[PDB]
Design an enzyme around this catalytic site. Structure first.
Site, mmCIF file in Angstrom:
data_model
loop_
_atom_site.group_PDB
_atom_site.id
_atom_site.type_symbol
_atom_site.label_atom_id
_atom_site.label_comp_id
_atom_site.label_asym_id
_atom_site.label_seq_id
_atom_site.Cartn_x
_atom_site.Cartn_y
_atom_site.Cartn_z
ATOM 1 N N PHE A 141 0.686 -1.402 -0.033
ATOM 2 C CA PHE A 141 -0.021 -0.002 0.089
ATOM 3 C C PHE A 141 0.846 1.521 0.253
ATOM 4 C CE2 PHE A 141 -4.282 2.129 1.186
ATOM 5 C CZ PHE A 141 -4.892 1.784 0.038
ATOM 6 N N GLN A 255 -6.109 15.662 4.668
ATOM 7 C CA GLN A 255 -5.414 14.703 3.696
ATOM 8 C C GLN A 255 -6.084 14.858 2.409
ATOM 9 O OE1 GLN A 255 -4.966 10.341 3.989
ATOM 10 N NE2 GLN A 255 -2.943 10.987 3.949
ATOM 11 N N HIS A 257 -6.327 12.887 -1.302
ATOM 12 C CA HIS A 257 -5.853 11.706 -2.308
ATOM 13 C C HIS A 257 -5.495 11.932 -3.729
ATOM 14 C CE1 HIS A 257 -6.712 7.735 -4.128
ATOM 15 N NE2 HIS A 257 -6.375 7.296 -3.053
HETATM 16 C C1 LIG Z 1 -15.022 8.744 1.805
HETATM 17 C C2 LIG Z 1 -13.947 7.626 1.614
HETATM 18 C C3 LIG Z 1 -13.218 7.173 2.922
HETATM 19 C C4 LIG Z 1 -12.363 6.227 2.984
HETATM 20 C C5 LIG Z 1 -11.966 5.425 1.888
HETATM 21 C C6 LIG Z 1 -12.797 5.787 0.644
HETATM 22 C C7 LIG Z 1 -13.568 6.923 0.557
HETATM 23 C C8 LIG Z 1 -14.361 7.108 -0.755
HETATM 24 N N1 LIG Z 1 -11.132 4.466 1.592
HETATM 25 C C9 LIG Z 1 -10.371 3.950 2.816
HETATM 26 C C10 LIG Z 1 -9.365 2.829 2.753
HETATM 27 O O1 LIG Z 1 -9.347 2.415 1.849
HETATM 28 N N2 LIG Z 1 -8.962 2.502 3.954
HETATM 29 C C11 LIG Z 1 -9.240 3.239 5.145
HETATM 30 O O2 LIG Z 1 -8.537 2.999 5.995
HETATM 31 N N3 LIG Z 1 -9.931 4.432 5.093
HETATM 32 C C12 LIG Z 1 -10.584 4.820 4.042
HETATM 33 N N4 LIG Z 1 -11.653 5.748 3.974
HETATM 34 C C13 LIG Z 1 -12.194 6.464 5.110
HETATM 35 C C14 LIG Z 1 -12.658 5.445 6.197
HETATM 36 O O3 LIG Z 1 -13.505 4.763 5.993
HETATM 37 C C15 LIG Z 1 -12.948 6.552 7.539
HETATM 38 O O4 LIG Z 1 -12.175 7.573 7.981
HETATM 39 C C16 LIG Z 1 -13.671 5.656 8.751
HETATM 40 O O5 LIG Z 1 -14.975 4.992 8.439
HETATM 41 C C17 LIG Z 1 -14.397 6.993 9.737
HETATM 42 O O6 LIG Z 1 -15.078 6.679 10.985
HETATM 43 P P1 LIG Z 1 -16.671 6.298 11.122
HETATM 44 O O7 LIG Z 1 -16.779 4.983 10.517
HETATM 45 O O8 LIG Z 1 -16.904 6.475 12.415
HETATM 46 O O9 LIG Z 1 -17.250 7.344 10.422
HETATM 47 P P2 LIG Z 1 -18.271 7.568 9.099
HETATM 48 O O10 LIG Z 1 -18.106 6.317 8.419
HETATM 49 O O11 LIG Z 1 -17.883 8.709 8.429
HETATM 50 O O12 LIG Z 1 -19.689 7.795 9.490
HETATM 51 C C18 LIG Z 1 -20.119 8.919 10.202
HETATM 52 C C19 LIG Z 1 -21.422 8.342 10.826
HETATM 53 O O13 LIG Z 1 -21.837 9.177 11.951
HETATM 54 C C20 LIG Z 1 -23.309 9.452 11.471
HETATM 55 N N5 LIG Z 1 -23.414 11.002 11.917
HETATM 56 C C21 LIG Z 1 -22.822 11.993 11.345
HETATM 57 N N6 LIG Z 1 -23.121 13.307 11.841
HETATM 58 C C22 LIG Z 1 -24.325 13.032 12.808
HETATM 59 C C23 LIG Z 1 -25.079 13.921 13.305
HETATM 60 N N7 LIG Z 1 -24.883 15.116 13.685
HETATM 61 N N8 LIG Z 1 -25.911 13.053 14.490
HETATM 62 C C24 LIG Z 1 -26.088 11.906 14.329
HETATM 63 N N9 LIG Z 1 -25.373 10.952 13.542
HETATM 64 C C25 LIG Z 1 -24.383 11.490 12.637
HETATM 65 C C26 LIG Z 1 -23.561 9.365 10.092
HETATM 66 O O14 LIG Z 1 -24.593 8.856 9.692
HETATM 67 C C27 LIG Z 1 -22.694 7.876 10.010
HETATM 68 O O15 LIG Z 1 -23.344 6.719 10.614
#
Ligand SMILES: *Cc1cc2c(cc1C)nc1c(=O)[nH]c(=O)nc-1n2C[C@H](O)[C@H](O)[C@H](O)COP(=O)(O)OP(=O)(O)OC[C@H]1O[C@@H](n2cnc3c(N)ncnc32)[C@H](O)[C@@H]1O
Ligand SMILES: *Cc1cc2c(cc1C)nc1c(=O)[nH]c(=O)nc-1n2C[C@H](O)[C@H](O)[C@H](O)COP(=O)(O)OP(=O)(O)OC[C@H]1O[C@@H](n2cnc3c(N)ncnc32)[C@H](O)[C@@H]1O
Ligand code: NA
Ligand code: NA
Lengths: 655, 655
Positions: A141, A255, A257
């Site tokens: 990676f 960050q 990409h």
């Molecule tokens: C966008 C992205 C990220 C990504 C990636 C490819 C893309 C297109 N590829 C990755 C990869 O190959 N390897 C890796 O290690 N990471 C990769 N990423 C990023 C990674 O998935 C994220 O950094 C990680 O998943 C973040 O943690 P988390 O799982 O907690 O958060 P989330 O998925 O962003 O979801 C947010 C959740 O919170 C709820 N939410 C948001 N705001 C509120 C409020 N105000 N109230 C209530 N709930 C809320 C969202 O709905 C969701 O469930």
């Protein structure tokens, strides 16, 4: 008044937010889990590359271990991270990845025999032994000198999110989608829960609970061109900042990409390169070990991207009616290594780019993708507002510094969820709270009023014009290359907008399932989170990691070995109150030097840096002559703290 | 921990408990309503006779008014009630009965023309005018010198309970049957809610809320022969006593009904007599104006019943394999006045007594029927444990004294619900509470332990033998006629049992939908409520109202013009702590004298009684010469307080 109690709330059913709720609900704590959209549709699902764990099973993951991962991580952090956290982490990822695999998650595993690797140059015929058959495999990676990035095709994040969410359902956790947190409830600097607005029915509820964790994911949407889903708006980051007691960290550390399919911004994995696929210029060659000989590709984000804008600013940007760009040729990386393991990153290209992957190079171009910063918390997870914990891209536990390392974010998600989980269960089960009806009412009746003003509002601003204008400002001046003058015309317009965002007028009056009203109370928050990054970056006068300042190009160790702790103490003020927190060199298991890549010798050095180094090698060599194992020495250089359950060392292949 | 909040709890979905919840839920207060069995199956449904309201529509209700009702009530109370409450009441019943009739309740109304009344002697041909057609009708009832008892056949209580319960459902109230309250939650003498045990799932929940009202109905089941349903066990009375801060009033004031179909104890209305039907002896005649000439029937409970035991104790008890008894001949009261308006009280006789009503006399015999005493509260409803309100047969607001007046209890139910409701809404909407997690936990985790001990119990007592033994003791020694020696062999065995009730053993171990475990934690409470009545009665050395003491036959005004305020301060103690509260003669709108019936001149008179009387007639005559209306004088003699909504005077027919 509508109030609902639970032993431990969890604002954000992401990937991290769910793991956490698993470690609490599994021990009696009645927990809830709010979420904009049903959990399994979070942004985690869209994870391509993989999860990085110092595993060491594959002939390449071979000889890997915490220490190596540790270093790989730290050097990548451009030294702006908390060493003892990055340490807790590495020692947990391995046993984290195993738990997953035992919960269902089907990790593409190793097969007895000779493979057909591509490396940088070309085909090299690798051969896995036979005592490796059936063990979690790995991929090369970004920025790793060892293959420790695990996978389940190129839709890894998916099979994980599900395996976890499914677990909650098995335990009786309570998911409550289409419910948003819009304000936290504090009394005497203590968090009692949150004020939620049922996105559907439209009515306000008070969710109280001993503990309260916020995992609202990145804030990539404050930018116009981002890979983040349309629900990664950082509202969750915003509400912890609106309490004026907790602080956001390195909000300016964003960050970017290198290969997001331009212009849509739909990700196109790094497995492209880690699997052998390489970047073609405008001339069409390899500005690869051309600009940086240790491979342009398989270098950090802030690295591999930087020059992707250099070649373009030299006018060599072979655009279209949307903008200049480059291409990624994986046409030569087999039609099996592409029709599988880069399966999505092939369909993605046909359904949108309207072309074939195992055929050509794609119209890519670097854009925002991750968000290091967020709610600043200590090592155990809690923040400055005792009672409010955090985890996931959402916050700044900071095992990242100014540059996350590919495949770390969704390892931090489960890891952090496991760790910060044990520390969250502990808090909720012990801490006793003084819930006051006057306070509960104050917040709720106070939020209801807010909604009304918005509906009865008479101002004439199109929130969609203010919103879209913000995303323009950011993606322009706070791009990969920032400079003094532009981080001023910005910090200014961004402010001038937070003032306009209070004079908006919506057309739809309904107080329920109103989407327009949503973008009205959501925007103001984004701006305040926007001011934290723009101003946060303007102040930080130097070039560290993903923070490239064309006018202060040297990684200042003597002045800037700190963390931009942004707060918003008063309700009125239009600009965040940035205070800085210093880093202790005499706690680092690795002192400030060259990162193994990037431009050589470009960091104004600090004196204690060296001194610490010497006495590292002193202790080092002495305890090696003494016959001490790497754990004994680790313990020497710098000890880190962990929870009971996750203390034991991770047993590896061949000991 | 499972906790559920609401602005105002309501322990007891009876007839009163529901009305109350209507006046709160109608003004924003989110309310809940716990209940052993679905509400519309409460004990109110089984109301025969009717509701008494100083209405005055019928040619007989004619000229009726608050004052008359007031007196009728007070004289019936044998002067042991709170005059200003009985006053609030009367001025509200009328507008209470109207509300009902507007909510659906179909009240049998007046028809233009000549009727066929029976009176005492016989047929008398009454004639209602024509300006009365269509107005709420009335019936002659026990101890009333005016026909103000309203009805909808002889299943009046039914059409009411429903009309109300139906209203809650229209407002969004929250009914939660098969859920029992087993302990109240107090901290610093304040009630925060209750601890509930889901009768089905079997798990304990904490129900917290600013206010908390208890309407658990009578306690007639502490007796063996009662008319009360099998869920009128006074557990609710018991838990307010177990907080050791609030007090139960006149726990020894238990009303007995004269004609409950023997031996089942299934009620047989008073409309029997108020409609003309009369009591036949063993010889078979009329011990009626034989023992008391102003009609034995159409005299209070404590009256009409007393001698029903005299004739029997003179050996004239023409028994069966179950006991001596009498008969009620309504055979001569028409087959239309019986096949209707005494419709149930006819089917009741065929399905159980296996005979016909418009044919013969029934095998009746006086038994317990009402429970004056209960959680003592002030005039506004609140008790000594600030925050805990009460209403309905359940408590002692005391507009009853030592003898409720037929058709008053289910008028007090809706009335009290209307009044105490306004004062409950007020409290919940203003009072602010300090909810503490340590406290919440203390009570809940503390109740859970209790359940376990009971299951793991190893003692060998058959709760069904202890339970049944209690009901024997009560019905025997604390019967209609009590005496010093017997209220001692009682107060003793009742205690000796509360000590045995802690060594019980259940066979069914399950912790859910367990009926046996229910009778295990329920009994101990009944005993403690039993000790309050037995001992409460033993102490009260005199004969007032329903309290007949063969050894202190005179209604002592000089010593006993008080209220037996029973408490249970310490958890260990085996006997209630009876303290007494004195009554103020210079606040009474009617001073202590002859009650209009019962045995003449049998009350050791008090001096202030007279003095107060004189200055009543003084003021009286003076303001009559002055040309003042009855409200002006009422205001003079004694002013009473009422809530805003129910202030206006009740407009009557012909003013
Ligand atoms: C966008 C992205 C990220 C990504 C990636 C490819 C893309 C297109 N590829 C990755 C990869 O190959 N390897 C890796 O290690 N990471 C990769 N990423 C990023 C990674 O998935 C994220 O950094 C990680 O998943 C973040 O943690 P988390 O799982 O907690 O958060 P989330 O998925 O962003 O979801 C947010 C959740 O919170 C709820 N939410 C948001 N705001 C509120 C409020 N105000 N109230 C209530 N709930 C809320 C969202 O709905 C969701 O469930
Ligand atoms: C038994 C009886 C009573 C009666 C009557 C005939 C019979 C056979 N005829 C009457 C008449 O003709 N005229 C009249 O005025 N009254 C008459 N009565 C008595 C009258 O109906 C009652 O005094 C009155 O209904 C009492 O008020 P209330 O409606 O509140 O109470 P209830 O009906 O007894 O119901 C009790 C409710 O509380 C729930 N409960 C009890 N304990 C608990 C606990 N621990 N936790 C939770 N809920 C509880 C019961 O389930 C019920 O809903
Ligand atoms: Na982060
Ligand atoms: Na009562």
């Amino acid at each position: 008044m509508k109030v609902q109690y639970c032993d431990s709330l969890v604002i954000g059913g992401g990937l991290a937010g769910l793991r956490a709720a698993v470690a609490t609900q599994q021990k009696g704590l009645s927990t809830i889990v709010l979420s904009l959209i049903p959990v399994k549709r979070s942004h985690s699902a869209a994870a391509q590359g993989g999860m990085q764990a110092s595993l060491g099973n594959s002939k390449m993951s071979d000889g890997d271990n915490e220490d190596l991962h540790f270093m790989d991580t730290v050097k990548g952090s451009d030294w702006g991270c908390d060493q003892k956290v990055a340490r807790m982490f590495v020692n947990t990822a391995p046993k984290a990845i195993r738990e997953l695999a035992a919960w269902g998650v089907p990790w593409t595993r190793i097969h007895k025999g000779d493979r057909m690797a591509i490396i940088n140059a070309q085909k090299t015929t690798i051969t896995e032994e036979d005592f490796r058959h059936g063990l979690i495999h790995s991929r090369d990676f970004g920025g790793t000198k060892k293959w420790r990035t695990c996978y389940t095709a190129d839709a890894t994040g998916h099979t994980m999110l599900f395996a976890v969410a499914n677990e909650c359902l098995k335990l009786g956790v309570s998911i409550q989608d289409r419910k948003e947190a819009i304000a936290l409830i504090h009394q005497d600097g203590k968090c009692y829960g949150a004020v939620v607005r049922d996105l559907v029915t439209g009515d306000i509820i008070a969710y109280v609970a001993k503990g309260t964790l916020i995992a609202t994911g990145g804030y990539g949407r404050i930018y116009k061109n981002t890979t983040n889903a349309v629900v990664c708006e950082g509202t969750g980051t915003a509400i912890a900042l609106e309490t004026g007691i907790a602080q956001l960290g390195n909000m300016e550390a964003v960050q970017f990409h290198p290969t997001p399919l331009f212009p849509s911004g739909i990700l196109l994995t790094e497995g492209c390169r880690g699997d052998g696929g390489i970047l073609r210029d405008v001339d069409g060659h390899r500005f690869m070990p051309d600009y940086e000989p240790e491979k342009k590709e398989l270098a950090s984000r802030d690295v591999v991207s930087r020059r992707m804008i250099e070649h373009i600013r030299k006018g060599k940007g072979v655009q279209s009616p949307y903008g200049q760009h480059l291409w990624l040729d994986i046409s030569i990386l087999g039609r099996k290594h592409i029709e599988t393991n880069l399966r999505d990153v092939q369909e993605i290209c046909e359904y949108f780019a309207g072309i074939d992957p195992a055929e050509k190079w794609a119209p890519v171009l670097p854009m925002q993708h991750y968000s290091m910063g967020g709610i600043r918390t200590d090592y155990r997870g809690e923040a400055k507002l005792k009672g409010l914990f955090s985890a996931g891209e959402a916050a700044c536990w900071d095992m990242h510094g100014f540059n996350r390392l590919g495949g770390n974010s969704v390892s931090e998600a489960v890891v952090a969820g496991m760790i910060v989980g044990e520390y969250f269960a502990e808090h909720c089960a012990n801490t006793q709270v003084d819930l006051e009806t006057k306070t509960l009412e104050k917040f709720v009746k106070g939020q209801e009023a807010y909604m009304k003003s918005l509906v009865e509002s008479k101002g004439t601003e199109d929130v969609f014009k203010i919103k879209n204008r913000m995303k323009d400002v950011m993606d322009d001046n706070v791009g990969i290359f920032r400079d003094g003058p532009h981080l001023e015309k910005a910090v200014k317009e961004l402010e001038e907008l937070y003032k306009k965002s209070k004079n908006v007028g919506i057309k739809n009056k309904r107080l329920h399932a109103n989407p327009e009203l949503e973008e009205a109370y959501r925007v103001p928050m984004m701006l305040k989170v926007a001011l934290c990054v723009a101003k946060g970056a303007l102040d930080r006068t130097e070039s560290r990691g993903a923070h490239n300042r064309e006018d202060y190009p040297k990684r200042d160790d003597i002045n800037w070995l700190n963390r931009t702790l942004a707060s918003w103490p008063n309700p009125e003020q239009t600009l965040p109150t940035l205070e800085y927190e210093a880093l202790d060199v005499n706690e680092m298991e690795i002192a400030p030097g060259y990162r193994g890549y990037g431009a050589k010798g470009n960091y104004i050095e600090n004196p204690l840096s060296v001194k610490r180094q010497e006495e590292i090698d002193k202790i080092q060599s002495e305890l090696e002559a003494a016959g001490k194992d790497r754990h004994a020495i680790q313990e020497a250089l710098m000890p880190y703290e962990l929870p009971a359950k996750y203390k034991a060392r991770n047993e590896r292949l061949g000991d």
